[PDB]
């Protein structure tokens, strides 16, 4: 057996390798009481994590301890470490090889700090941390393509070549779920809906899951809107009230196209991967319009692969077939291909272990985990 | 007897006393003292008055008295009363020595803090208790439902209190006092039938219309069905015979004294009512709590024991959800689901959550405020004691 | 202000009087037409003198129903109008041999007629209310108290 | 001359551009009587607003048609208009173009229908819908600042730098002087005093802005009035009665900086300004922070300045010169730099016309305002 997980930032999955889909999956989140004042003859935790937080959110503060990809609070992670340990998967951690995961152009002690307190705290054999979109190019029978993730807090697109990484034209966005979430939370203010609390995040977080999608033709869809309610929808609080949603279902999407409607300054979700395959080698970008795979949950609106499709051939020389690639596992890929990997017929050696680690330090994994 | 933690419910209208694992009140008695009177009233040898006269003591003599309340609106009003109050408890009610024991008190969630220093104080440095505890009385109402959320509204004789708790959580910025209760109602009633031409001033007679509202009152359904059945028939008119033998006809008054719960500006108070003042709180929670404070709307006290009180505030929070949340829209008022609860103990609820709180803390000898901390930290022992 | 709206209707629906009353396992057109072929026979028995025959012939079918208001008052006419031509003789030998469910109808059609003294002689309707009450007692308008709306 | 009205959340402000001060200022309050005993013929009516509603208090039953900033009430905010027209400015509105004022992240619906009602009510010739933040940056002399405002019912930060507003950095707080109102009504309920009607709550906010005060380090200041009564203080009450009020006099303002104090789940004012410049470009960051403008009558409280400084200096970086700038005109400098604003010469071809409204409908506004 191994053991492993998309240690993500808003949504922690994980399960053994060799399993179809991860057997565990949650918010990653501590959640903490809000208010000083209890029934003093009842029990209360000192702190609450994943579906447990999530369904006492009235109460509590809630807090993911990764933003943007970066663990930010160390003491949240090792309790939601020890959650999916302990909890969720409930093992003994002492005896599983383990497979972890981050970003590409991430902070180097992010890959330090979850190296020490795996082997320091949770006292494993073995782990492995790898790039979440070299992973989420496993899962689809697959050595050449690029890959767009975006998860919850990160978007990076990752161009591979018959199973070598280009680091040169691999590129990272700070726009996902997190970003598309507050903007969402923003523009139903200008419906006279308020939504304030770290628990109502939770409750438009809802919203945009269920209700929006990616517009093909934004300029015409928001005239559509204007001139017809035909295109609004309802969602129902958590209290029994109704709340209309319109044009606003989109407008939200449409801010990975459009960066500077939260003010970012920075090029569309379609420019990065066309910006990343011009950047590629001058013969090995020669498939990748036609071999562009989609991954993690931001990828899972209705309409987002369709819209790629219209901006990337709208960029691109028409002398050569342009598609698109969005399997339905889209936003479990990323562990789909940690759980191929560590089930690889070669990979069983490939591992950061304590023979090395007791030496080496957490200094270690920057020596083969890319 | 037993070696138990005390439970006293010193409230404003009645004390109710007994000890941790009590399923009721050992004793519950008027919270009153009383004064030798005499009034050009009848007088016989077969009894005989002390200067001080107190709780069962003075209800049953009570016209011989100059009666006296040492509490109003939740707040001990007169200390020198309410001293002869609990020495009447401790000594001739109970039959105990205080020295060393523990005893858990109540009260309101907005009180003056001078009335919990002075009354830890009092525990502490006439009666020798060895600690207490003060309970917010709502909170206690919510431990005899065996109940860890739901908004709880405890309607006594001093005042209207909301406390709502969410999965054991107290949520202390939600908490409100309406300042109607029992006493407001009585005196709303004397006001009633001195428009028929009665009259109740002596001191004494405010224990008979209370007694008289506590048989006759209820709370109207539907306002204008009562006022039809007040105006066309006969049918409301009822009669009631005084401790002198004087019998009074009521009518209107029945529902249109306790309407002052439902419409405090008949008693001129500006507040929203019961139903409005419970709707306006849960309103308030967070969205995600809601459902769960209108699905456990808990009544307590005694004046929320008006025949039909649990019908009117169901039905006119449905009618305040269905003007202010759906805008008059029927569509979906099927779908708003409200749960008052209206248990038959309710009454005696802060007594009875009083005992099961005091029985959860007696082996945990430091939640109590001590009196060998007491006397190191004077008030700011109190501290313990929640925000 | 909220005291006004009435939320019962819409969230508590009371009972229908056909959640108390078995529904009628006839068409409208159906006793429209039994109806029909009675009121004549009705008719008939009066020219011929036999005004007692014509009720028992009249009263051995009744119409009911909210959607058959036309016919349960054409059926009303020729009922007063038989009431009206049996002599008050005969009203005691006639009544006794009546069963309790032929006295139960008489008994609810007297108060049909006694509800519109513009078009009905409650003169007749009194007089047959005086002797059928005499000679079944009280409890065949006990049966009118509690009967079928409809009828 | 144009007319320039600051439509307060509790205080309505009113005058001519080109003069240095309001008018009229006056409670945004329709008031109603609380009893139907009457004298007849005797001047007696069915509403009394702003002056009247105030001196008849103790007999009405007092309202505010806007809470949190947006128009809970079109039928008496209407009165309130009227008011200001017909009866202490003395003109005819249909005259005079008016600019009003709005706060940033409103309802879109309240912004239409206030331009609505004064095209179809009061006839205006021209109207403008300025954002409060932008006005009190343009009666301060400056093009660079971060604009902390704070009115009756809202507080809201605008980073605005060389004319040009960072729309995605602006913050938003539903607690200002109503909130500090309310939790000053209840936290006076433990010195035994009881404020319950609408009329006591305007006593409270009389208590409020002649004793309150900012504490520049509270558990000093809490420690403080724990050891003497050199920190109490005596209130006049209308019936000759005396209060005294201690330590109520600062942990009322201390909930601007701990809005947790009524169970509000948010950064204080801050935290709240700190997280806006921070969230503006690098290069902008430098400078806003020597240009803190204050604004409204909630940032009028004695010892405000001086602590929002040693509070936004142990946020930001110890090499930054940080300035709070904060006029003794502060509670009008949002209806001041409004008569700036409708007194330019450039900002007369960009107010919305009668004309343009007939041709467009109330939904111009967006196209027209910021
Ligand atoms: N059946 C009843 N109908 C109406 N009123 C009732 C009824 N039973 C009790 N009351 C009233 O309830 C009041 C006493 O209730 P309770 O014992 O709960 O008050 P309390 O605890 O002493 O007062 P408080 O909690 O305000 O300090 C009196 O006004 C009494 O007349
Ligand atoms: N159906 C969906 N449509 C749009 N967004 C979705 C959908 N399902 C989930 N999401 C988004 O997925 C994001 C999380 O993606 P995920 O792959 O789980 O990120 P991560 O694992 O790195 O935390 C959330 O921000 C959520 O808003
Ligand atoms: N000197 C002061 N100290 C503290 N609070 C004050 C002071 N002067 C006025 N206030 C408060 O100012 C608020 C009104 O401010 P204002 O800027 O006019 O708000 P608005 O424009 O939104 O109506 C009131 O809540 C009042 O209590
Ligand atoms: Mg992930
Ligand atoms: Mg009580
Ligand atoms: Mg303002």
Same mark, same amino acid.
């Given at each position: 057996?191994?053991?492993?997980?998309?240690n993500?930032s808003?949504?922690?999955?994980?399960?053994?390798?060799g399993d179809?889909?991860?057997?565990?999956?949650?918010?990653?989140?501590?959640?903490?009481?809000?208010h000083?004042?209890?029934?003093?003859?009842?029990?209360?935790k000192?702190?609450?994590?994943?579906?447990?937080?999530?369904?006492?959110?009235?109460?509590?503060?809630?807090?993911?301890?990764?933003?943007h990809?970066?663990?930010?609070?160390?003491?949240?992670?090792?309790?939601?470490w020890?959650?999916?340990?302990?909890?969720e998967?409930?093992?003994?951690?002492?005896?599983?090889?383990?497979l972890?995961? =981050?970003? !590409?152009?991430?902070?180097?002690?992010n890959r330090?700090?979850?190296?020490?307190?795996m082997? +320091? %705290?949770?006292?494993? /054999?073995?782990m492995?941390?790898?790039?979440?979109?070299?992973?989420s190019?496993?899962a689809?029978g697959?050595?050449?393509?690029?890959?767009?993730?975006?998860?919850?807090?990160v978007?990076?697109?990752?161009?591979?070549?018959?199973?070598?990484?280009?680091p040169?034209?691999?590129?990272?966005l700070?726009?996902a779920?997190?970003?598309?979430?507050?903007?969402?939370?923003?523009?139903?203010?200008?419906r006279?809906?308020?939504?304030?609390?770290?628990?109502?995040?939770?409750?438009?977080?809802?919203?945009?899951?269920?209700?929006?999608?990616?517009?093909?033709?934004?300029?015409?869809?928001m005239?559509?809107?204007?001139?017809?309610?035909?295109?609004?929808?309802?969602? =129902?609080? !958590?209290?029994?009230?109704?709340?209309?949603?319109?044009?606003?279902?989109?407008?939200?999407? +449409? %801010?990975?196209?459009q /960066?500077?409607?939260?003010?970012?300054?920075?090029?569309?979700?379609?420019?990065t991967t066309?910006?990343?395959?011009?950047?590629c080698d001058?013969?090995?970008?020669?498939?990748?319009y036609?071999?562009?795979?989609?991954?993690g949950?931001?990828?899972?609106?209705?309409?987002?692969?369709?819209?790629?499709?219209?901006?990337?051939?709208?960029?691109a020389?028409?002398?050569?077939?342009?598609?698109?690639?969005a399997?339905?596992?889209?936003?479990?890929?990323?562990?789909?291909?940690?759980?191929?990997?560590?089930?690889?017929?070669?990979?069983?050696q490939?591992?950061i272990?304590?023979?090395?680690?007791?030496?080496?330090?957490?200094?270690?994994?920057?020596?083969?985990?890319? | 007897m037993?070696?138990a933690?005390?439970?006293?419910?010193?409230?404003?209208?009645?004390?109710?006393?007994?000890?941790?694992?009590?399923?009721?009140?050992?004793?519950?008695?008027?919270?009153?003292?009383?004064?030798?009177?005499?009034?050009?009233?009848?007088?016989?040898?077969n009894?005989?008055?002390?200067?001080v006269?107190?709780?069962?003591?003075?209800?049953?003599?009570?016209?011989?008295?100059?009666?006296?309340?040492?509490?109003?609106?939740?707040?001990?009003?007169?200390?020198?009363?309410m001293?002869?109050?609990?020495?009447y408890?401790?000594?001739?009610?109970?039959?105990?020595?205080?020295?060393?024991?523990?005893?858990?008190?109540?009260?309101?969630?907005?009180?003056?803090?001078?009335?919990?220093?002075?009354?830890?104080?009092?525990?502490?440095?006439?009666?020798?208790?060895?600690?207490?505890?003060?309970?917010?009385?709502?909170?206690?109402?919510?431990?005899?439902?065996?109940?860890?959320?739901?908004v709880?509204?405890?309607?006594?004789?001093?005042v209207?209190?909301?406390?709502?708790?969410?999965?054991?959580?107290?949520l202390?910025?939600?908490?409100?006092?309406?300042?109607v209760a029992?006493?407001?109602?009585?005196?709303?009633?004397?006001?009633?039938?001195?428009?028929?031409?009665?009259?109740?001033?002596?001191?004494?007679?405010?224990?008979?219309?209370?007694?008289?509202?506590?048989?006759?009152?209820?709370?109207?359904?539907?306002?204008?069905?009562?006022?039809?059945?007040?105006?066309?028939?006969?049918?409301?008119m009822?009669?009631?015979?005084?401790?002198?033998?004087?019998?009074?006809?009521?009518?209107?008054?029945?529902?249109?004294?306790p309407?002052?719960?439902?419409?405090?500006?008949?008693?001129?108070?500006?507040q929203?009512?019961?139903?409005?003042?419970?709707?306006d709180?849960?309103?308030?929670?967070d969205?995600?709590?809601?459902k769960?404070?209108?699905?456990?709307?808990?009544?307590?006290?005694?004046?929320?024991?008006?025949?039909?009180?649990?019908?009117?505030?169901?039905?006119?929070?449905?009618?305040?959800?269905?003007?202010?949340?759906?805008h008059?829209?029927?569509?979906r008022l099927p779908?708003?689901?409200?749960?008052?609860?209206?248990?038959?103990?309710?009454?005696?609820?802060?007594?009875?959550?009083?005992?099961?709180?005091?029985?959860?803390?007696?082996?945990?000898?430091?939640?109590?405020?001590?009196?060998?901390?007491?006397?190191?930290?004077g008030?700011?022992?109190?501290?313990?004691?929640?925000? | 202000?909220?005291?006004?709206?009435?939320?019962?209707?819409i969230?508590?629906?009371?009972?229908?009087?056909q959640?108390?009353?078995?529904i009628?396992?006839?068409?409208?057109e159906?006793?429209?037409?039994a109806?029909?072929?009675?009121?004549?026979?009705?008719?008939?028995?009066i020219?011929?003198?036999?005004?007692?025959?014509?009720?028992?012939?009249?009263?051995?079918?009744?119409?009911?129903?909210?959607?058959?208001?036309?016919?349960?008052t054409?059926?009303?006419?020729?009922?007063?109008?038989?009431?009206?031509?049996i002599?008050?003789?005969?009203?005691?030998?006639?009544?006794?041999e009546?069963?309790?469910?032929?006295?139960?109808?008489?008994?609810?059609?007297?108060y049909?007629?006694?509800?519109?003294?513009q078009?009905?002689?409650?003169?007749?309707?009194?007089?047959w209310?005086?002797?059928?009450?005499?000679?079944?007692?009280?409890?065949?308008?006990?049966?009118?108290?509690?009967?079928?709306?409809?009828?």
């Amino acid at each position: 057996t191994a053991l492993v997980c998309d240690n993500g930032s808003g949504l922690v999955k994980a399960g053994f390798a060799g399993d179809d889909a991860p057997r565990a999956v949650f918010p990653s989140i501590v959640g903490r009481p809000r208010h000083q004042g209890v029934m003093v003859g009842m029990g209360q935790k000192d702190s609450y994590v994943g579906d447990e937080a999530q369904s006492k959110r009235g109460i509590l503060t809630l807090k993911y301890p990764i933003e943007h990809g970066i663990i930010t609070n160390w003491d949240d992670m090792e309790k939601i470490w020890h959650h999916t340990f302990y909890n969720e998967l409930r093992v003994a951690p002492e005896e599983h090889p383990t497979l972890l995961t =981050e970003a !590409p152009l991430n902070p180097k002690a992010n890959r330090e700090k979850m190296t020490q307190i795996m082997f +320091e %705290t949770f006292n494993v /054999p073995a782990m492995y941390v790898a790039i979440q979109a070299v992973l989420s190019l496993y899962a689809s029978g697959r050595t050449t393509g690029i890959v767009l993730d975006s998860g919850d807090g990160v978007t990076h697109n990752v161009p591979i070549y018959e199973g070598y990484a280009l680091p040169h034209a691999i590129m990272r966005l700070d726009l996902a779920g997190r970003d598309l979430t507050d903007y969402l939370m923003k523009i139903l203010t200008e419906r006279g809906y308020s939504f304030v609390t770290t628990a109502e995040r939770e409750i438009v977080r809802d919203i945009k899951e269920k209700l929006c999608y990616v517009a093909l033709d934004f300029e015409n869809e928001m005239a559509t809107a204007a001139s017809s309610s035909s295109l609004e929808k309802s969602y =129902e609080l !958590p209290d029994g009230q109704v709340i209309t949603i319109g044009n606003e279902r989109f407008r939200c999407p +449409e %801010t990975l196209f459009q /960066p500077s409607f939260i003010g970012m300054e920075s090029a569309g979700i379609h420019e990065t991967t066309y910006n990343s395959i011009m950047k590629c080698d001058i013969d090995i970008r020669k498939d990748l319009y036609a071999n562009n795979v989609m991954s993690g949950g931001t990828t899972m609106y209705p309409g987002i692969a369709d819209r790629m499709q219209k901006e990337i051939t709208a960029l691109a020389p028409s002398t050569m077939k342009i598609k698109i690639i969005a399997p339905p596992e889209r936003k479990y890929s990323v562990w789909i291909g940690g759980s191929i990997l560590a089930s690889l017929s070669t990979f069983q050696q490939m591992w950061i272990t304590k023979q090395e680690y007791d030496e080496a330090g957490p200094s270690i994994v920057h020596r083969k985990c890319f | 007897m037993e070696s138990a933690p005390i439970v006293l419910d010193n409230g404003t209208g009645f004390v109710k006393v007994g000890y941790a694992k009590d399923n009721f009140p050992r004793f519950q008695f008027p919270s009153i003292v009383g004064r030798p009177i005499l009034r050009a009233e009848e007088k016989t040898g077969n009894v005989q008055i002390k200067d001080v006269m107190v709780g069962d003591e003075a209800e049953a003599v009570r016209s011989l008295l100059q009666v006296k309340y040492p509490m109003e609106n939740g707040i001990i009003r007169d200390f020198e009363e309410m001293n002869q109050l609990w020495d009447y408890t401790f000594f001739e009610k109970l039959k105990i020595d205080p020295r060393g024991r523990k005893i858990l008190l109540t009260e309101p969630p907005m009180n003056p803090v001078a009335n919990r220093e002075k009354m830890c104080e009092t525990m502490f440095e006439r009666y020798g208790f060895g600690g207490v505890y003060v309970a917010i009385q709502a909170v206690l109402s919510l431990y005899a439902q065996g109940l860890s959320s739901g908004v709880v509204v405890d309607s006594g004789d001093g005042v209207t209190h909301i406390v709502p708790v969410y999965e054991s959580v107290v949520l202390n910025h939600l908490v409100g006092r309406l300042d109607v209760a029992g006493r407001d109602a009585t005196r709303y009633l004397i006001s009633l039938l001195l428009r028929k031409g009665y009259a109740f001033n002596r001191t004494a007679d405010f224990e008979t219309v209370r007694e008289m509202k506590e048989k006759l009152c209820y709370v109207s359904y539907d306002l204008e069905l009562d006022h039809k059945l007040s105006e066309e028939t006969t049918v409301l008119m009822r009669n009631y015979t005084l401790p002198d033998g004087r019998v009074i006809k009521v009518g209107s008054e029945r529902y249109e004294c306790p309407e002052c719960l439902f419409q405090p500006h008949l008693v001129g108070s500006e507040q929203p009512g019961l139903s409005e003042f419970i709707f306006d709180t849960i309103q308030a929670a967070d969205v995600d709590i809601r459902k769960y404070l209108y699905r456990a709307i808990v009544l307590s006290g005694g004046s929320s024991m008006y025949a039909g009180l649990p019908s009117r505030l169901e039905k006119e929070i449905k009618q305040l959800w269905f003007e202010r949340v759906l805008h008059g829209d029927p569509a979906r008022l099927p779908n708003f689901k409200v749960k008052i609860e209206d248990a038959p103990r309710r009454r005696h609820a802060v007594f009875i959550g009083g005992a099961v709180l005091a029985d959860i803390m007696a082996q945990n000898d430091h939640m109590w405020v001590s009196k060998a901390e007491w006397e190191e930290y004077g008030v700011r022992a109190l501290d313990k004691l929640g925000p | 202000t909220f005291r006004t709206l009435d939320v019962d209707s819409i969230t508590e629906p009371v009972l229908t009087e056909q959640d108390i009353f078995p529904i009628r396992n006839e068409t409208a057109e159906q006793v429209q037409a039994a109806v029909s072929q009675l009121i004549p026979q009705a008719r008939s028995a009066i020219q011929t003198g036999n005004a007692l025959q014509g009720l028992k012939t009249l009263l051995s079918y009744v119409p009911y129903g909210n959607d058959v208001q036309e016919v349960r008052t054409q059926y009303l006419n020729a009922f007063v109008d038989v009431l009206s031509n049996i002599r008050a003789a005969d009203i005691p030998a006639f009544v006794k041999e009546c069963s309790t469910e032929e006295i139960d109808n008489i008994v609810n059609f007297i108060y049909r007629g006694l509800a519109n003294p513009q078009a009905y002689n409650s003169s007749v309707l009194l007089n047959w209310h005086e002797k059928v009450v005499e000679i079944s007692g009280i409890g065949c308008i006990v049966r009118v108290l509690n009967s079928r709306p409809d009828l």
